[PDB]
Design a protein around this ligand. Structure first.
Ligand SMILES: *C(=O)N1C[C@H](NOS(=O)(=O)O)CC[C@H]1C#N
Length: 475
C-alpha cells in the first residue's frame, strides 16, 4: 500500500499561499470482508451521505475485487467518525487534497490537481515533479506490518506571480470587459529586467475549488491572434537597423491608401502626407510601414520578429502553451511584405507579445521568461541593438504623450495600440520610459475598436502596478 506524500506549497512571489496540501482521510473497503457485516452497511452509508441501495449495489457488483474506494477527501474529523464505527473491512488512508486560497483570481496560472493529487493543469502540472515528492510504501497482510519506505514530501514553489498585481489586473480586466460588452480577454504583466511574469489573468475564469470550457482557457498562453499594429515597432526596429532610415526620415503616405496589385491598404487616420518614423507610429499608418518595408525588405523584418520571439516557442514548458506562427517565406512579394510589416502576416500569443515588448524595453536584451520567482537572473540575449531599441523606446514614448488615453499619470509610459484579427482590441507597452520596469499586454475580445478600448486599461493597470512596485515617478 502506497503512503501518499505532502505536496509542495505553491506561493506567489511574496509568499502568499496559492495551492495548499491539506490532510484528508480516504476510506477504502475490501468487499468480501464487508460482505460479512452487511447489518453495518446502512449506518456506514448514512455516515457517508450515500444512498443505501447504491452503496449496497457497489459492494455486491464488485464482490470479488478486494479493493474499492468508499469515499475520498474527507476531513480528518469525518474520517475519524466513520472509522470509530468499527465496520469490518473498512480501512482508512491519510491523503492530501489541494485547496486554492486565491481561487479564481489566479486559476489559470496555478492550475490544479486530479483526484490522485497529481498535477493536471497550469503550474501544478508544469512543476509536478518538483511539487509531488515521492510516495512511501507500506506492507500489509489482514494486518499492518512495516513502513518499508518513507514518503518524502514535495518542495515549495514560489511563482513569479505577484498576487497584488494579479488582483489588480484581474479586477481591471473584468471591468474593462463588462464596460465593452466583451466576454473574453487577457492581461499579461512582465518584469522587463528579470523575465518574470508578474501577472497573467484571463476572462472568463473559474473557481478551482468548486464548469464551462470557455472559462478554462488560459487565453494569455493559448489564444492566438494576428497582432496587427502592435508589431509595427519591430518593423521600425528593422528599418532603423537596416542603415537606411533615420527617425526623422520622411515617408509620404498621402492619401492614406496604397494599392498593391489588387489589394488596397487603407490607413485608419488619413490626414497625413509626410510623416517621420515617429509619426508613422503615432498615426499607426499601415501605408507608411508598408513603404518602409518595401525599401528594407521583409527578410529584415522577419528576422527581428523571430529574434524577439513572436511566433516562437517561449520555452516556458507550460502545458498547452501555443506558439502561433511566423511564416518564413524566404522571399516575400510586395503584398506579403506589407502584410508582415503591419502585423497581419503572423500569429502570436499575449505572452509572446509581452516578452517581445520586454526585450524592446530592456534596451534590446531579451531576458528569458519565467513563471517562478527569479532570484538569480540569467544573462539575457541581445536581440535588438541597444541603439535601435533605445530609439524605438523614445518613439513609443511619443506615441503615448502625443493615444492620450494611455498616459500614466506621474510617469512617462510607452506603448502602441492595435486591432487583432482571428477582432480583438490590443495594447502593448512598458513603463516608465526612462528606465523601463514592466511590460504589459491587454487583449479584449470585442463583440469603437482598438486604441480607444485597450489604452485606458493599460493606463489604469500600469498606474496601479508601478505604485504597487514602488517605482519612483519619472515625470
Ligand atoms: C493596427 O492594428 N491597425 C492599424 C490602424 N490603427 O490601429 S489602432 O487600433 O487605432 O491603434 C487600424 C487598426 C489596425 C489595422 N488595419
Amino acid at each position: 500500500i502506497a503512503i501518499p506524500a505532502h505536496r509542495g506549497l505553491i506561493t506567489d512571489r511574496n509568499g502568499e499561499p496559492l495551492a495548499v496540501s491539506t490532510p484528508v482521510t480516504t476510506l477504502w473497503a475490501n468487499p468480501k470482508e464487508l460482505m460479512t457485516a452487511k447489518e453495518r452497511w446502512p449506518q456506514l452509508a448514512a455516515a457517508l451521505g450515500q444512498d443505501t441501495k447504491l452503496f449496497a449495489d457497489r459492494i455486491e457488483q464488485n464482490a470479488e475485487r478486494e479493493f474499492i474506494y468508499l469515499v475520498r477527501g474527507l476531513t480528518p474529523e469525518q474520517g475519524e467518525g466513520v472509522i470509530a464505527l468499527k465496520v469490518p473491512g473498512v480501512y482508512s488512508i491519510e491523503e492530501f487534497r489541494r485547496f486554492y486560497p486565491a481561487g479564481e483570481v489566479v486559476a489559470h496560472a496555478v492550475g490544479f490537481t486530479d483526484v490522485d493529487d497529481r498535477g493536471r493543469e497550469g503550474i501544478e502540472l508544469a512543476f509536478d515533479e518538483w511539487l509531488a515528492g515521492v510516495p512511501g510504501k507500506r506492507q500489509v497482510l489482514i494486518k499492518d506490518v512495516q513502513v518499508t519506505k518513507n514518503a518524502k514530501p514535495g518542495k515549495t514553489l514560489a511563482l513569479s506571480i505577484d498576487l497584488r498585481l494579479q488582483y489588480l489586473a484581474h479586477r481591471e480586466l473584468r471591468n474593462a470587459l463588462l464596460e465593452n460588452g466583451a466576454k473574453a480577454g487577457s492581461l499579461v504583466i512582465m518584469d522587463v529586467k528579470t523575465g518574470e511574469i508578474l501577472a497573467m489573468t484571463n476572462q472568463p475564469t473559474y473557481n478551482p475549488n468548486n464548469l464551462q470550457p470557455a472559462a478554462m482557457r488560459n487565453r494569455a498562453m493559448i489564444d492566438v491572434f494576428e497582432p496587427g499594429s502592435t508589431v509595427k515597432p519591430f518593423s521600425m526596429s528593422a528599418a532603423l537597423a537596416s542603415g537606411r532610415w533615420k527617425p526623422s526620415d520622411i515617408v509620404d503616405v498621402y492619401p492614406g491608401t496604397l494599392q498593391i496589385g489588387r489589394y488596397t491598404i487603407r490607413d485608419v487616420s488619413r490626414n497625413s502626407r509626410q510623416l517621420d518614423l515617429t509619426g508613422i507610429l503615432i498615426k499607426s499608418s499601415n501605408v507608411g510601414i508598408s513603404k518602409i518595408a518595401f525599401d528594407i525588405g521583409a527578410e529584415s523584418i522577419y528576422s527581428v520578429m523571430q529574434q524577439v520571439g513572436l511566433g516562437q516557442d517561449t520555452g516556458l514548458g507550460f502545458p498547452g502553451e501555443r506558439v502561433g506562427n511566423l511564416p518564413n517565406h524566404r522571399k516575400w512579394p510586395k503584398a506579403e511584405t506589407a502584410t508582415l510589416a503591419y502585423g497581419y502576416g503572423l500569429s502570436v500569443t499575449a505572452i509572446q507579445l509581452a516578452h517581445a515588448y520586454a526585450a524592446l524595453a530592456n534596451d534590446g536584451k531579451s531576458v528569458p521568461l519565467s513563471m517562478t520567482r527569479v532570484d538569480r537572473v540569467p544573462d539575457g540575449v541581445q536581440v535588438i541593438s541597444p541603439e535601435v531599441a533605445s530609439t524605438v523606446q523614445g518613439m513609443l514614448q511619443q506615441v503615448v504623450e502625443a493615444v492620450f488615453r494611455a498616459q500614466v499619470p506621474g510617469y512617462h509610459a510607452a506603448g502602441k495600440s492595435g486591432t487583432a484579427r482571428k477582432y480583438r482590441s490590443l495594447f502593448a507597452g512598458f513603463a516608465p520610459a526612462t528606465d523601463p520596469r514592466i511590460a504589459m499586454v491587454v487583449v479584449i475580445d470585442e463583440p469603437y475598436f482598438g486604441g480607444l478600448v485597450s489604452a485606458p486599461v493599460f493606463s489604469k493597470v500600469m498606474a496601479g502596478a508601478l505604485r504597487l512596485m514602488n517605482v519612483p515617478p519619472d515625470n
